Symmetry: C3
Subunit: 194 residues, 3 copies
């Protein structure tokens, strides 16, 4: 399975687009799997003892976390080798905004274990992302004060994703998520895996 | 020792802010060391005959600067091991303007010796930085002619620091140094270390 | 020999600038070699039987191209150590635009084998790049639709070149290619190599 990492800053509509990518690939009868990196990390944590739930996993020693990310990364690469023909997409972050600053989602020890073909950056107009902050308060962590915060996050995601791309030899692709339709992004993503 | 790297372009008030961090951590009795990267570079340079003053080290061939960089990094790595517990702040740069172009302050061979937790980008409005540079003649710097050169250097600092963050697994925090109030930045810096 | 990597996005006048670097150095009797990374790749293909022309080379498996990229990188490093004093310049790309997104021209497994001192980024005004687009069809590049795509390509190139510079510890030099005279750029390239 050819691997593609789909990243997006909160509010871009990454879950809707991913739902559309699966729907379109199933309809063409094309083998595909969509893995949520955080969920697979937790699954990995459960299988190897490290922790029994998220809070437990999150309050873990930095040296343990780095091991766990490596094992999850190795695990996902296995899933891809085992699934044969198809497309495996990872749903993760290029950068995670934290109070302590931007944390790269694909650091060297993770990215070179996975070796993806493509890293996607889901972007939209900062205005459209601010509207999707108060329109759908399905988490509402209201971290995006003004659009200058969104812009800055977009940019750090761009810098971090390219640095991860340079490490693995993968391409970086910007995909605009159209407000109306999620199918535009979904087809651009599918076109890129060809 | 928990390492935090504090970078900033010349004129952001890196020192002002760093003094205030020592004040605040000394006053609450927390063990903290503040090392200036360039001071360690100059020591090694002086003993080898490469340069006499800090403002000439950046004019050196890329290969000599690389040598000083590795030596300094090995030194600071040693001081961090003999610190036991508490916060170590490395006062340095994300990028160094040189006749040969921008030299990354935290290349892979430096990042592997230190392994910071957080990498800070101290920033300020370019107009405010342009002024601060003319008020200091214990340094100088004729390369910061207009506001265009400062923007471009703030950007390369961002690109470079994020690439370094991605290699290390560390976070990158942009801190605005509020004109006239070093304690804001100093406190964001302290909170981010927790 | 000191290694310099000269990159530019299509349409900046890189081959012209590279010719002046050769003439100015010849008329100074400085030893210099100017290698095209893809050509060196092609050469290694032939002498290993993989491919026979640029066209059949660009069709090879991903694992095969990667093979060619490493050996070519290693090879170019031997050529520079063998060549004694002097300046070796590699003409390649910082990023390449592909249907899958931006492909880093200097991934880790390549930049760490070459270990340049300088990575140059030739830029020009977007308008100028477009102006040369209608003017020459040695090629006929109809990929640059508008100036916003030129801008994006430029930033990705900076992002990637900086990341590559952080892995090898090389500088990143932006060189503006002036439209009237290609010597402004070649003198800067040469100055930067001292
Ligand atoms: N991490 C670094 N890598 C390379 N050169 C550095 C680094 N940190 C500082 N320098 C150099 O040391 C000089 C003085 O440091 P500063 O006193 O903090 O300006 C700089 O202008 C650079 O020439």
């Amino acid at each position: 399975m050819k691997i593609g990492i789909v990243t997006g800053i909160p509010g871009v509509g990454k879950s809707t687009v991913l739902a559309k990518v699966k729907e379109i690939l199933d309809n063409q009868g094309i083998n595909n799997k969509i893995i949520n990196y955080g969920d697979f990390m937790l699954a990995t944590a459960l299988k190897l003892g490290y922790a029994k739930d998220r809070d437990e996993m999150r309050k873990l020693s930095v040296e343990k976390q780095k091991k766990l990310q490596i094992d999850a990364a190795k695990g996902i690469a296995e899933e891809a080798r085992a699934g044969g023909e198809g497309y495996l997409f990872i749903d993760t972050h290029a950068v995670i905004r934290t109070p302590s600053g931007y944390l790269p989602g694909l650091p060297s020890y993770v990215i070179t274990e996975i070796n993806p073909s493509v890293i996607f950056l889901l972007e939209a107009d900062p205005k459209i992302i601010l509207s999707r902050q108060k329109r759908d308060t399905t988490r509402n962590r209201n971290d995006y004060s003004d659009e200058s915060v969104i812009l800055e996050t977009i940019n750090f995601a761009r810098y971090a994703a390219t640095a991860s791309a340079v490490l693995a030899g993968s391409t970086v692709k910007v995909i605009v998520n159209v407000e109306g339709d999620p199918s535009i992004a979904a087809n651009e993503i599918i076109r890129s895996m060809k």
